[PDB]
Amino acid sequence: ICVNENGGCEQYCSDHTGTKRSCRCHEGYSLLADGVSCTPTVEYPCGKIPILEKR
Amino acid sequence: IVGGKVCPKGECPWQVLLLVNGAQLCGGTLINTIWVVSAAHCFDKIKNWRNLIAVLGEHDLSEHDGDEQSRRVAQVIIPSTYVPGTTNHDIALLRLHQPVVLTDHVVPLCLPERTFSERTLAFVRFSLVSGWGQLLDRGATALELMVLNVPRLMTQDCLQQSRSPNITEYMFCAGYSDGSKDSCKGDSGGPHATHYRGTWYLTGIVSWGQGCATVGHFGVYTRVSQYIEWLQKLMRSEPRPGVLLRAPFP
Numbered sequence: 001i002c003v004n005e006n007g008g009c010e011q012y013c014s015d016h017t018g019t020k021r022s023c024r025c026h027e028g029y030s031l032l033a034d035g036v037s038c039t040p041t042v043e044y045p046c047g048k049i050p051i052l053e054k055r
Numbered sequence: 056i057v058g059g060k061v062c063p064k065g066e067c068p069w070q071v072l073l074l075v076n077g078a079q080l081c082g083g084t085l086i087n088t089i090w091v092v093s094a095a096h097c098f099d100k101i102k103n104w105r106n107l108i109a110v111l112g113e114h115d116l117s118e119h120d121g122d123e124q125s126r127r128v129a130q131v132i133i134p135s136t137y138v139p140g141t142t143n144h145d146i147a148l149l150r151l152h153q154p155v156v157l158t159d160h161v162v163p164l165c166l167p168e169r170t171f172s173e174r175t176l177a178f179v180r181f182s183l184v185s186g187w188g189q190l191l192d193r194g195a196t197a198l199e200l201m202v203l204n205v206p207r208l209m210t211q212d213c214l215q216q217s218r219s220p221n222i223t224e225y226m227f228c229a230g231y232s233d234g235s236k237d238s239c240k241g242d243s244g245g246p247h248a249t250h251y252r253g254t255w256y257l258t259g260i261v262s263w264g265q266g267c268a269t270v271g272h273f274g275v276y277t278r279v280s281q282y283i284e285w286l287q288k289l290m291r292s293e294p295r296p297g298v299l300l301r302a303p304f305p
């Protein structure tokens with residue numbers, strides 16, 4: 001599943017028994033209910049530029 | 056950085072400045088509040104191990120504006136496979152004595168998971184390379200942080216396009232062969248940052264080349280994807296006496 005277009009995951013992808021796919025996020029992020037998107041859980045998550053995000 | 060631009064203050068918030076006896080040594084990449092990724096070759100001639108400082112939130116070297124945070128380097132971890140004076144396995148993992156405080160000007164770059172980095176980030180063409188290195192080959196170094204956009208090459212295309220050490224599976228080429236744009240020797244240890252779906256990731260470390268922006272040559276970067284597990288296991292370890300530590304690789 002993860003082999004093709006990162007399994008739809010915005011960040012990390014895990015393959016499971018059958019057609020089951022689990023998207024995952026880097027620490028400082030939480031997975032949204034769409035099961036593919038990652039939302040920051042912290043003020044300064046990794047790989048985001050605050051001055052660019054704030055404007 | 057050759058043929059790039061000033062990185063606007065705060066737009067490279069993971070950039071690290073490495074200092075020895077207060078003098079400019081190399082660049083680095085903040086990957087969390089305690090750990091910095093740099094190049095192993097940066098520590099080849101270090102004698103004063105206790106006088107290593109990492110500065111975060113740096114921009115302009117001539118003025119202190121209050122966004123700078125300094126930390127003493129507690130440990131420098133280098134792979135057992137790296138041979139001083141050579142190009143292969145050019146990675147160093149640095150432990151800060153105390154964590155940096157994240158602010159608008161101090162933010163880590165994401166260390167990606169291996170598979171994601173190999174299958175997805177490896178195919179993002181352009182990435183950003185940054186530092187306070189030489190502005191020209193045999194030129195003055197920069198006072199303000201510089202940034203350059205570079206395209207990545209498959210090792211086969213790099214070898215064919217290049218006019219001398221081998222490009223191993225632990226390296227990748229990025230840049231231009233026209234002599235206009237490149238990272239330079241004072242940029243060593245700095246990031247090669249890849250953007251994917253609104254987030255930036257660490258994919259390479261400024262490593263080596265045949266002179267900066269040399270016609271018929273590309274910049275060579277450490278392939279960080281080969282080191283993720285090595286890095287992850289080390290970040291889970293307790294520090295050891297002595298700053299320099301040689302850890303087995305794989």
Ligand SMILES: O=C1NCCc2ccc(Cl)cc21
Pocket residue numbers: 237238239240241242243261262263264265266267268273274275
């Ligand atoms: O001469 C160089 N050309 C390509 C980038 C580079 C990086 C780091 C060092 Cl030491 C030298 C160079």
Ligand SMILES: [Ca+2]
Pocket residue numbers: 113114115116117118119120123
């Ligand atoms: Ca400054």
